[PDB]
Amino acid sequence: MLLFCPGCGNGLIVEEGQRCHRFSCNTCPYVHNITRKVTNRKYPKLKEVDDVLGGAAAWENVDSTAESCPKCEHPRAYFMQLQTRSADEPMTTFYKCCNAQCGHRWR
Amino acid sequence: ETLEALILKELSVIRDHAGSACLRELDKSNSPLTMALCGSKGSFINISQMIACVGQQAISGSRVPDGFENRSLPHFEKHSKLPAAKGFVANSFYSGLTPTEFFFHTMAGREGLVDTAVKTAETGYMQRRLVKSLEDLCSQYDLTVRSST
Amino acid sequence: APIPTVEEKWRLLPAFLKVKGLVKQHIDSFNYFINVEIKKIMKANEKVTSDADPMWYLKYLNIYVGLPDVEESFNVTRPVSPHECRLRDMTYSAPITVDIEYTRGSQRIIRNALPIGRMPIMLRSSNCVLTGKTPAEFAKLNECPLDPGGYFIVKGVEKVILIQEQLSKNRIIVEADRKGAVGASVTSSTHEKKSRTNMAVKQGRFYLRHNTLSEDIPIVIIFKAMGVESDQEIVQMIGTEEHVMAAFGPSLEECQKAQIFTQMQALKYIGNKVRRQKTKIEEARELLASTILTHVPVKEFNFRAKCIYTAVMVRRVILAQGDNKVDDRDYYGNKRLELAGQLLSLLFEDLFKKFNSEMKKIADQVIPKQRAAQFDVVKHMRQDQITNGMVNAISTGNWSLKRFKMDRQGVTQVLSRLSYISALGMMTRISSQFEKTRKVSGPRSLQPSQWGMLCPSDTPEGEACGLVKNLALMTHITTDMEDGPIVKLASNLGVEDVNLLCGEELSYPNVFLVFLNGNILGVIRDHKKLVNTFRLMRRAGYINEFVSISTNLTDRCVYISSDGGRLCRPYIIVKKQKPAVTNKHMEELAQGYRNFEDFLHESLVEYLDVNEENDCNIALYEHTINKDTTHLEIEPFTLLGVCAGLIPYPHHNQSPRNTYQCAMGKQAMGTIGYNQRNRIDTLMYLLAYPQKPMVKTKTIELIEFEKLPAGQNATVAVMSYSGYDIEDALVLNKASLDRGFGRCLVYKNAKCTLKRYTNQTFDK
Amino acid sequence: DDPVVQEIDVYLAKSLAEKLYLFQYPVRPASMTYDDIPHLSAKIKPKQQKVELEMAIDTLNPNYCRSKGEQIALNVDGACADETSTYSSKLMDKQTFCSSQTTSNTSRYAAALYRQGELHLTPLHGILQLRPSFSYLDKADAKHREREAEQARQRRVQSYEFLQKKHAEEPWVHLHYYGLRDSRSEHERQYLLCPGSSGVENTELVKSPSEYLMMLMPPSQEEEKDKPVAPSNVLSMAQLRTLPLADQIKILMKNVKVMPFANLMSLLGPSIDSVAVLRGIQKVAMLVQGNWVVKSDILYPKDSSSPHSGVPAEVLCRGRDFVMWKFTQSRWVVRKEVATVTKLCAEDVKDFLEHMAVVRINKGWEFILPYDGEFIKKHPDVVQRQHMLWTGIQAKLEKV
Amino acid sequence: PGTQMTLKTFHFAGVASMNITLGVPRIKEIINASKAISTPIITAQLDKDDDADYARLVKGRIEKTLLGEISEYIEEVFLPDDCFILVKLSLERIRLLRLEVNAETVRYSICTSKLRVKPGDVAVHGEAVVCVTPRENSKSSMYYVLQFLKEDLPKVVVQGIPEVSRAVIHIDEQSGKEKYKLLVEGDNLRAVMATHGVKGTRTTSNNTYEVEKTLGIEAARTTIINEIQYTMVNHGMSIDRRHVMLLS
Amino acid sequence: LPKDVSVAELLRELSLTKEEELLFLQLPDTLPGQPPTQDIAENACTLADLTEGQVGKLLIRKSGRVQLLLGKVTLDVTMGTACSFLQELVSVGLGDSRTGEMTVLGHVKHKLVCSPDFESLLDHKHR
Amino acid sequence: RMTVGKLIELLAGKAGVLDGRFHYGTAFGGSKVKDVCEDLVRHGYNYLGKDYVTSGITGEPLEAYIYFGPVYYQKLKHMVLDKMHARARGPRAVLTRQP
Amino acid sequence: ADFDGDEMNLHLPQTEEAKAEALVLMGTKANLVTPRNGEPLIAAIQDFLT
DNA sequence: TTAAGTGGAGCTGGATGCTCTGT
DNA sequence: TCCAGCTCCACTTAA
RNA sequence: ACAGAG
Ligand SMILES: [Zn+2]
Ligand SMILES: [Zn+2]
């Protein structure tokens, strides 16, 4: 990440001193000792998952005493939750029911 | 993109069903129908297009691209993906085209005029190269094909 | 309930054609040249001074263009009509007369009417003898009342300056390179210099390129050379989002590798890159102040207003990589149209400067050599530089003006006289810029932006297809406005000076820039109040009605355009689902209580422009009016042009058929005019017994085609007869041909010249 | 929307109007303030306002890399000279700030010391941007450079060499700096207020909205070089100041060949002198069949050429006046071949008529507007003298 | 026939994707024998074509995926004792996309053509995490090259074939059968012929230069025949095979 | 963060906090006055030409509309660009020929923009 | 070619000559088919313009009704007399001794 | 060709050997089928099919 | 350490439909 | 406006 | 050098 000197406002570089790593200016004496953990997270875009779960994938989220689906009122349906973008997104819930003479997709 | 293929599906069904409705109520000795049946001039598309319904006007294989900001013309609302906003002519040539439908049909027409104007330079150079490469090849009396060398 | 209709709304179109459109665009440019721009050229060149022997000077006070005159053998001169020029093969021209103040030892000698040349006078302009005559007095001049004018007569041939289509100078293009990189450019044409400057991302880092630099140079060095030295203030201008900073990051890391931390170091760096036409520091500092981005003013070598502009460019390149919103050159808001008067203005400025420099050369030769007599330049005012510069450029059609690096060819064409429509058709043509370089299939297409400005159908079929185009029936091309009150109003509508703020505000969502012709005039919050109030000030006549204002919300700018050359079209103003034009107003128009300019003043009609109808929502018909409609279309048949206006029921035909009639209808035999028997031409075709069309458009009545028609009504049986009609062939009747159907006359010329030579001998 | 809250009085003070500056620091955030930092000097040029400041940076705090500070100070200053020296000590002691000028005029900017219930405005003499200077690196290079190695017309004003020498003429003014904590700042802050009464009606600012609009949007042309006598159809709905009123009827009546009486009150409005003006209107229009009709002299003086194509014809105004006379006696012009009696072209008569009437089958033309009342205005006597005057016009026709 | 080809549209190899040049520009591309062309397609036949679960495995062995596409974040960490760039793999998304990559494999995706990074400098502290300790480039650069890696490290290829931009599964509509063929939009025929689970004996390419380099002159000769005849048939032209035979 | 509005700015400095604060406001190029005896021509009028005293009244209306009534005319007041760099309001006084005093009076946080209400000016007498 | 406008121009013109009118053909407007059909039947012609036609060769009537009307026809400048050309032998260029 | 003002060229072979090569090889009756796919091109057209 | 064979990037020179019909 | 050869220059192997 | 025609 860009961080800039309070004195002259040139761009800082990270270098190493005799006791700590420092943010340092190239044009003035200013240095800033890294005393504690500092971080910067990118969170890039993941792949699409839409065509990855279709067609009898290896899902696993089903559990004992799980709810029945609302149309058929039978537990013959899978349900899962996934991030669609990066993991800062709140996870979305989705479910699909597959029964005899009955095909549907629901949200 | 999925929405464009559903819209193009609906709009094709309209032309085809309105087309197959006109040809059932035409009588024999209808002169366009005679020329279509014997194949001397025209086709059942042309009959259906001037009686029943002109099709979706398509430019480069797609609905009319936005030539203003997020709309085709200022007469439609922005982002609107309705049939008439993107080049569906609901009129036939008998009923007469409306001002916006006439403009989209003229857009689709000029791409055929412009292809013909390009097709001369696009192909005549190609044929000159082919002839200079192939012209020496003659079928010989010993049933072989040999170059000049 | 249905929305009611005003059925007399079509009348606004005849009232419009009395003043604007329909070769009037040609006339109102030439008038602007000879009545104001010829004075500005003289004003910018009002003094000439010999370098040798100073304190002797020639001064230009005023310039006049006069009335057409012929110069004859024994120096008799008499006024001349346009038709005498066609016959005798001479140029229809008026003398340029100038008044001068100059030194003959006495330091103020004056002349009040020195003739320095002759100006071709375009027909039906303010100096032509035809203007304001009655049809009974056209007959004395052998001229036709319906003849459009808008053309010259040079050496007896009728020559039209065609409308040239151009790109708008001083605008940030953002476009893809051949290699798929994204960059930006701005062709910075001013009256003193045209130049192009580019923004390139050739290695993930931003370089500026210009023809005066031997190599393209990192943009952070240019920021530092302009005196924004801190890296923070640079990044504040470019943008403060994390991905915009990440994209600009590798460009800071370049300048920090070099020793460039100071303005003087940066200017030294640029100095060692300048191609040579003080060394390092001033050939850089002057170059940034005068030639790079030259349309952006720097007043006293303060570069703040140029830094904000070059930051706007870099930000638009950055945000065009993440999504490929590259701009299209094909949108007509970007296109500009250059007419007769704006080309001749450049030609005359070249000729007048060559005239002053030739006369300066004369003064420099004789004053420190020849004689004690304080010579008068009046004896050296040879007229031939002005006259033969004008007449050769118009006749040959090549406009090689080395002052502005312009080498156009094919600017003029001979006016076609195959029919009445062939002449009036040519007066509305718009030649394009590419001029058939290669089969592009990109600008040849019909862009939707041409709606109501350019005709959909009237284009050639052939290699010129889509490159030659014609105006619609109801279009107007703006002139250049005074530009003064637009600034004084805008600075009161809450715009803030961009010098009072740092970079960071440009990256706020609630801050929009205001541009006027590509110069930044400030920033504003609440752009909607600005745009609405500016339109109100236009409607009430305080701002000139051709000034367009529009918003781009994707790139957060408000644009105000006041330059000449942009297509305007009139629309009716609609407020709260009711049109302003009531039945009361249209009855008052027919009776004469009001004219079309009173529809502009009362805010009933306003001129929209192709950048401004991007914002507006326009109803075709009253029954299409919804809640959010701003304008109503006056007459939708005026989407078509002049030649397409002959076709009956064109909306019942397949579109290529209309295009072919627009070609065929220019070639039909007919009647040139009322002067056609007193007219001697290279080749003229006439039909003996012409008839007017039994089915006709309203456009046929506006252009008066049914006064001199081209065709005959034929009793057609649509049947298959004799087999000699298989492929478009048509069987005629022998008895009809004998009685006079299709009887035509062909007229051809033959001319001979008998000259008197330099030796006293003659042809006989 | 009534002013339900905070009707705030606004007062103006001039005691600091030639003294008050806005300084702003484009690269320093609003939370980091120079209030603690000791200031060592302030320099100004009072015209061509260019302020410079020098601020001391301490060296015992951990953020100062003394090893690098010794190096940069040794680059700038020769190792032991100290007669002229940017930094007195062996380290970089000082940061210098250099101003850029934002705008030439500042007349429209005011500082506003808000207090509860009142606002106090004060004009600004200047707005300056202060930036950290990098002049010490340029000088560090200059002291590294020296160790290693009847004329024609001229335009001095447009050159950086001449312009800088002009700015060098103004002598430096030195200022003592009193920061925000010092009592002089709490003292002089009271001079932004103005002593005055709670309620005063201002002698100035008395202009009206329509005078104010004309002041901020001045008219383009103070007077035009030509004068419009109005033969050209200028805007009849615009009450042109330099045109007399009577001429606006003349141009209108040339447009509107016939019009009703009552429209004159509707177009002029009751503020006209609507009784005397008939001696003007009598010269340009006369009432025929309940309505006004344009007089002959407005359309064609006696040398006009033909206005149409076909065979040319000369003007003959009594060839018009006889037609409008027939409309005064008869119900209409009612017969087929009046063009033979008056001898002129049918292309004249049927074109002249076409501006006042519409055709019905065989019986000529129909008068386009209904028979309004003559006696709407009070005048009794004109009803008989009109017949006397139209008898004279008939008697003129009786010569030919 | 080139003058009859109106440069038609409505052509997408039946899949409503994977646009192709056809008409005169496709004939021009064939007879020029250029070494690269716009829109190359490799058609790969799958041997275990029974069901989609096998298709998505071998699709993931040819289609390029970047490191950034499988990582839920990348972070710079500055500590007093050292500084490094860290990448955490989203092993849930690995387990769904059926890719054969983990932390120990990502160490092998890096160290190749990435500013001479050392194998020692890359550590695999857990099955989900990797850390890249930056080193001085020592050539036209500053040790602060972390800002280079922070935009460059996601774009390294962990799995698949580098020349393949994308791949798509295609479906037959005949009543008798249902089997999935794999369409590859890319320009490495040899690699697609050699991945486990592609029937290499029956894959083909548009590009005559690829077929020549991989299969020899006689397979390239047949591809000129097949591709000209394919382009002619789509525009409804017909030519006797003996003419395109002689040209090839 | 969101954006404040001029009704809210003046309400915070009246009720919630009695502390005084320096606004910075931009006026139109001409105020509705005459330069008093200043030897002119209908030239521009600025705050430098007027004399001390009450100059006008500032009205806050319902629905957040704010007006500056500065004569017979009312000018509209809106929030300017939100600056977040440091701004210092300073006196400079050249009390002697060569020396003087510089004094920092306070920091400036908010900008107000005053503009004429062109719709109201024009709705009086259209054109 | 779908030039339905020619088919309407023939019909509108025919209804026009029979009653002394010029029927308008303006784009996006014009005189409608429903109006001109009623003009033809009032004058005793068939509403769609088709007429009972007799062969001039054989004198026997034609089976199909033939569409009859006035269509505007314009003569173009391209005439065969200005275009017929023949060379047997003739003048030659000076540089290359070819025609 | 389409008879809409189309023009065509004519050449008269000036040699007996050029007549025979024109007549036997280039005659219309010897060229009823195109070389390409072997399909007839000289055949009936509109009003001969109808 | 360096001699050398081969990758990758920029410069350069070539090409872009057939005719009549007029000024 | 699009595209093959030719030459310059970094980048590993190898002695 | 420009416009045409197919
Ligand atoms: Zn610093
Ligand atoms: Zn189910």
Between the alpha carbon of residue C317 and those of residues A97, C198, D62, the distances in Å are 48, 11, 41
Q: How far is C-alpha C19 from the chain's CA centre? A: 19
Specify whether the CB–CB gap between D23 and D142 falls below 8 A.
Answer: no
Specify whether the CB–CB gap between B57 and B107 falls below 8 A.
Answer: yes
Checking each nucleotide's C1' against the CA of C467, the nearest proves to be K3
Which strand (E) or helix (H) includes residue C513? Answer: strand C512-516
Which strand (E) or helix (H) includes residue B35? Answer: helix B31-38
Tell me the C-alpha distance between C606 and C580, whole Å: 11
Tell me the C-alpha distance between A57 and E92, whole Å: 14
Question: Which two tokens mark D219?
Answer: 């008219």
Tell me the C-alpha distance between C489 and C543, whole Å: 9
Hey, what amino acid is at D384? Answer: Q
Any known ligand binding at H47? no
C409: number of Cβ within 10 Å? 11
- Three-class secondary structure assignment of D153-216: CCCCCCCHHHHHHHHCCCCCEEEEEECCCCHHHHHHHHHHCCCCCCCCCCCCCCCCHHHHHHHH
Specify whether the CB–CB gap between D377 and D367 falls below 8 A.
Answer: no
| Cross-strand bridge partners of residue B86 | none
Phi, psi of C241 (to 5 degrees): -70, 150
Specify whether the CB–CB gap between C127 and C66 falls below 8 A.
Answer: yes
3-state secondary structure of H39: coil
Tell me the C-alpha distance between C718 and B77, whole Å: 45
Helix pair C231-238, C242-255: axis angle to 10 deg: 140
Looking at residue A34, the DSSP 8-state letter turns out to be: -
Helix pair C282-290, C263-271: axis angle to 10 deg: 90
Query: Which residue has tokens 């309209």?
Result: B14
C324: Cβ contacts below 8 Å, ≥ 6 apart: C176, C182
Q: Is the CB of H7 under 7 A from strand I?
A: yes
| Cross-strand bridge partners of residue C686 | C670, C745
Question: Which two tokens mark H18?
Answer: 């050029």
DSSP track, D359-381? E-SSS-EEESS----GGGSS-ST
Specify whether the CB–CB gap between C414 and C13 falls below 8 A.
Answer: no
C-alpha count within 13 angstroms, C-beta hemisphere, residue E137: 13
Q: Which residues of B touch E3 (CB under 8 A)?
A: 119, 123
Ligand 1 centroid vs A23 CA: distance in angstroms? 10
Across the interface, of G2, G28, G64, the residue whose CB is closest to B98 is: G28
Identify which ligand lies nearest to the alpha carbon of A74: 2
* Closest residue by Cα to residue C136 from D322, D300, D253, D254: D300
Tell me the C-alpha distance between C476 and C471, whole Å: 9
Hey, what amino acid is at C102? Answer: Y
Tell me the C-alpha distance between D41 and D176, whole Å: 7
Tell me the C-alpha distance between B137 and C360, whole Å: 73
Hey, what amino acid is at D284? Answer: V
Specify whether the CB–CB gap between C287 and A46 falls below 8 A.
Answer: no
Tell me the C-alpha distance between C496 and F26, whole Å: 9
Alpha helices (H) in D291-375, listed in sequence order = 296-299, 318-329, 338-341, 346-352
Specify whether the CB–CB gap between F114 and F76 falls below 8 A.
Answer: yes
E218: Cβ contacts below 8 Å, ≥ 6 apart: none
| Chain D nearest-CA residue for F24 | D111
End-to-end CA distance of chain A: 39
Specify whether the CB–CB gap between D393 and D321 falls below 8 A.
Answer: yes
C57: Cβ contacts below 8 Å, ≥ 6 apart: C47, C48, C49, C102, C103
Judge: E239–H38 Cβ closer than 8 Å, yes or no: no
Helix pair E24-32, E217-234: axis angle to 10 deg: 170
Q: How far is C-alpha F5 from the chain's CA centre? A: 16
Specify whether the CB–CB gap between C183 and C113 falls below 8 A.
Answer: no
The domain made up of A49-106 has a fold known as: N-terminal domain of TfIIb (2.20.25)
Rg (CA), chain H: 15
Hey, what amino acid is at D356? Answer: M
Tell me the C-alpha distance between E131 and E103, whole Å: 10
| Chain B nearest-CA residue for H46 | B40
Between the alpha carbon of residue F117 and those of residues C485, C535, D209, the distances in Å are 17, 14, 10
Question: Which two tokens mark F89?
Answer: 């309001």
- Alpha-carbon dihedral D76, D78, D83, D88, rounded to 10 degrees: 50
Specify whether the CB–CB gap between E179 and E86 falls below 8 A.
Answer: no
Specify whether the CB–CB gap between D38 and D53 falls below 8 A.
Answer: no
Judge: G78–H5 Cβ closer than 8 Å, yes or no: yes
Query: Which residue has tokens 């066609």?
Result: C86
Tell me the C-alpha distance between D226 and C312, whole Å: 47
DSSP track, D72-86? HHHHHS-TT--SS-S
Question: Which two tokens mark D370?
Answer: 């209904």
B38, B69, B122: which to substitute to probe chain C, counting the most C Cβ within 10 Å? B69
* Closest residue by Cα to residue F4 from D113, C510, C514, D24: C510
Specify whether the CB–CB gap between D66 and D91 falls below 8 A.
Answer: yes
Specify whether the CB–CB gap between C644 and C658 falls below 8 A.
Answer: yes
Between the alpha carbon of residue D76 and those of residues B118, D58, D71, F23, the distances in Å are 70, 19, 9, 42
Hey, what amino acid is at D212? Answer: Y
Hey, what amino acid is at C403? Answer: R
Question: Which two tokens mark C456?
Answer: 């959909």
Question: Which two tokens mark B44?
Answer: 């059942």
D38: Cβ contacts below 8 Å, ≥ 6 apart: D55, D56
End-to-end CA distance of chain D: 77
Q: Do you know the residue count of chain A? A: 107
Checking each nucleotide's C1' against the CA of E32, the nearest proves to be J3
| Cross-strand bridge partners of residue G71 | C714
Query: Which residue has tokens 């369409």?
Result: E183
Q: Label residues C575-599 b or e (16+ Cβ within 10 Å = b).
A: eeeebbbeeebbebbeebbbbbbbb
Look at strands A38-41 and A31-33 and give their pairing. Answer: unpaired
Question: Which two tokens mark C77?
Answer: 């001169």
* Closest residue by Cα to residue C347 from C379, C395, C382: C395
**Strand J: which positions are within 7 A of a protein CB?**
1-4, 11-12
Technique used to solve these coordinates: cryo-EM
Query: Which residue has tokens 């018909």?
Result: C621
Tell me the C-alpha distance between C745 and C742, whole Å: 10
Distance from CA of E50 to the nearest CA of C (A): 40
Tell me the C-alpha distance between C118 and C135, whole Å: 29
Query: Which residue has tokens 């002593």?
Result: D195
Between the alpha carbon of residue D363 and those of residues C317, D319, D326, D337, E1, the distances in Å are 77, 20, 14, 11, 73
3-state secondary structure of D287: strand
Which chain C residues in 632-691 lie under 8 Å from chain D, judged by CB atoms? 674
3-state secondary structure of C11: helix
3-state secondary structure of A72: coil
Q: Which residues of H touch C725 (CB under 8 A)?
A: 47
Question: Which two tokens mark C616?
Answer: 């507006």
Hey, what amino acid is at C418? Answer: L
3-state secondary structure of D321: helix
Q: What is the largest CA-CA distance in chain G?
A: 75
Tell which phi-psi region holds residue B33, choosing left (phi > 0), alpha (psi between -120 and 50) or beta: alpha
Question: Which two tokens mark D185?
Answer: 């700042």
D350: Cβ contacts below 8 Å, ≥ 6 apart: none
Question: Which two tokens mark D298?
Answer: 């407005």
3-state secondary structure of A78: strand
Q: Is the CB of C468 under 7 A from strand K?
A: yes
Tell me the C-alpha distance between C297 and C295, whole Å: 6
Between the alpha carbon of residue D16 and those of residues D177, D192, D193, E191, E222, the distances in Å are 17, 7, 10, 82, 94
C567: number of Cβ within 10 Å? 25
Tell me the C-alpha distance between C313 and C518, whole Å: 12
Alpha helices (H) in chain E, listed in sequence order = 24-32, 52-62, 91-97, 103-109, 146-152, 189-192, 208-215, 217-234, 241-247
Question: Which two tokens mark C377?
Answer: 């330049």
* Closest residue by Cα to residue D12 from F73, F114, F46: F46
- Alpha-carbon dihedral B40, B44, B50, B52, rounded to 10 degrees: 160
Question: Which two tokens mark D116?
Answer: 């509860």
3-state secondary structure of E12: coil
- Three-class secondary structure assignment of C235-273: HHHHCCCHHHHHHHHHHHHHHCCCCCCCHHHHHHHHHCC
Tell me the C-alpha distance between E89 and E104, whole Å: 11
Tell me the C-alpha distance between A14 and E82, whole Å: 11
H25: Cβ contacts below 8 Å, ≥ 6 apart: none
Specify whether the CB–CB gap between H39 and H33 falls below 8 A.
Answer: yes
> Which resolution in angstroms does this entry have?
2.8
D106: Cβ contacts below 8 Å, ≥ 6 apart: D123, D124, D125, D126, D127
Question: Which two tokens mark E229?
Answer: 């005849």
A103: Cβ contacts below 8 Å, ≥ 6 apart: none
Q: Do you know the residue count of chain E? A: 248
G28: number of Cβ within 10 Å? 20
Looking at residue G94, the DSSP 8-state letter turns out to be: S
Specify whether the CB–CB gap between C335 and C609 falls below 8 A.
Answer: no
Question: Which two tokens mark C753?
Answer: 């010249």
Tell me the C-alpha distance between H1 and C573, whole Å: 54
CA C63 to C1' I10, whole Å: 56
Backbone gaps in chain C, preceding residues (C–N over 2.5 A): 277
Query: Which residue has tokens 């646009």?
Result: E19
C388: Cβ contacts below 8 Å, ≥ 6 apart: none
CB pairs under 8 A between C and D: 101
Q: Is the CB of H5 under 7 A from strand K?
A: yes
Question: Which two tokens mark D146?
Answer: 């020296």
Question: Which two tokens mark D286?
Answer: 């006369």
Between the alpha carbon of residue D175 and those of residues D39, D44, H41, the distances in Å are 11, 8, 103
Any known ligand binding at C263? no
D37: number of Cβ within 10 Å? 14
DSSP track, chain F? -----HHHHHHIIIII----EEEEEE--SS-S---TTS--------TTTS-SEEEEEEEEPGGG-EEEE-SSSEEEEEE-----EEEEEEEEE--SSSEEEEEEEEEEEEEEEEEE-HHHHHHHS--
Quote the Cα angle for C423-C425-C429, to 5°. 120
Quote the Cα angle for C29-C31-C36, to 5°. 100
Tell me the C-alpha distance between C83 and C143, whole Å: 7
